[PDB]
Design a protein around this ligand. Sequence first.
Ligand SMILES: OC[C@H]1O[C@H](O[C@H]2[C@H](O)[C@@H](O)[C@@H](O)O[C@@H]2CO)[C@H](O)[C@@H](O)[C@@H]1O
Ligand code: ZN
Ligand code: ZN
Ligand code: ZN
Length: 403
Amino acid sequence: KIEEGKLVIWINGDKGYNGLAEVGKKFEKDTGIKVTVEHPDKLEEKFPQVAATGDGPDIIFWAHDRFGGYAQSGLLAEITPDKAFQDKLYPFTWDAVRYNGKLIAYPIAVEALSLIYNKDLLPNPPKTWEEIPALDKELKAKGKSALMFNLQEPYFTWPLIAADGGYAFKYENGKYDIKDVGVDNAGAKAGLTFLVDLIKNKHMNADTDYSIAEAAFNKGETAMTINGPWAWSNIDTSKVNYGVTVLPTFKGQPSKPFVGVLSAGINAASPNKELAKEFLENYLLTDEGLEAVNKDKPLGAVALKSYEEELAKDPRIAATMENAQKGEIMPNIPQMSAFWYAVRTAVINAASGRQTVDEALKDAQTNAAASEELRKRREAYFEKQQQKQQQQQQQQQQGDLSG
Ligand SMILES: OC[C@H]1O[C@H](O[C@H]2[C@H](O)[C@@H](O)[C@@H](O)O[C@@H]2CO)[C@H](O)[C@@H](O)[C@@H]1O
Ligand SMILES: [Zn+2]
Ligand SMILES: [Zn+2]
Ligand SMILES: [Zn+2]
């Protein structure tokens, strides 16, 4: 319980928060209610820490994968859009924000990573990963590199890992299996190996992060990067002649991005739930609301039918979709937090050459399952204690005192 007269909204610093705030100023102008857009760091880690005290914003924006965990900890209010409003959004976007049969967020846009390339350096982009090392060496004769992307976040590395058969959680019998992690298999080991070889062989640098990769591409120093729709604003401004296309194949298989649906959840502790719903339904999720955000930082393939339709002809959104088709929409189950942390640690560890790919992926295999492991052992502990207590009492009733 923190606000009453106003809406505080959290969104990631790489998204169009300036357009979001514009929508806020329009909401204030019509309503009298002040809207404050914030973009703090690590907001997806910060939210569950602050919302569990009665602090935290009224509306949080993130990809849908985190919302399962938030919902499970009781942190999101159930949203109540009517059927008419639901028909305004593509059905599959609604499923991404369904947890235990309840709607826990409003979907905004579908996001997938793509290959972004400088047409002046590289008029034909490579179709496979395997040809990138030779391309990197060729480009050195011009003082350029082939490719730079964010190696610090497993999101950007996942598509190459999943290509030859890496997965998060096997879907089976209408259930995600959470002792069945696919980060340790041969296809995952082949993908990470190839990445680590690129790094060790100096085609890439292990400490390359989001902003270093961005700068290199937007200044014209690298022929390619890998990024989502949000990144296109800055490329336009740099004036680099760029195309957006299919991610390269690995071992003849498509790269498989983990697809995110940018979503808006309402804090369960918020005393402004109705204002938040009003804001989201009638201000943000309209052509004009999404136009404001989208013209700041592109959203991708938007959830709202009428506006997606207005953006239908953009070849960059087409490539986003093609990349989404070859990928999978992320699970939103509570275990996603642990999966990401485990894969982050493993990539960073293998990249720096501290652990082998084998050791690092085996470690992530354990780390991603360790939560359900603890739960199983906790159950067994109390069941065994109950058994011993039962058996000790039945043995103790070998004799009893009587008056
Ligand atoms: O790298 C792990 C990370 O991946 C995804 O986060 C993406 C997010 O979906 C995009 O909206 C964009 O902001 O980049 C992020 C990667 O830095 C997952 O959504 C997230 O839970 C996960 O930690
Ligand atoms: Zn700001
Ligand atoms: Zn309907
Ligand atoms: Zn090489």
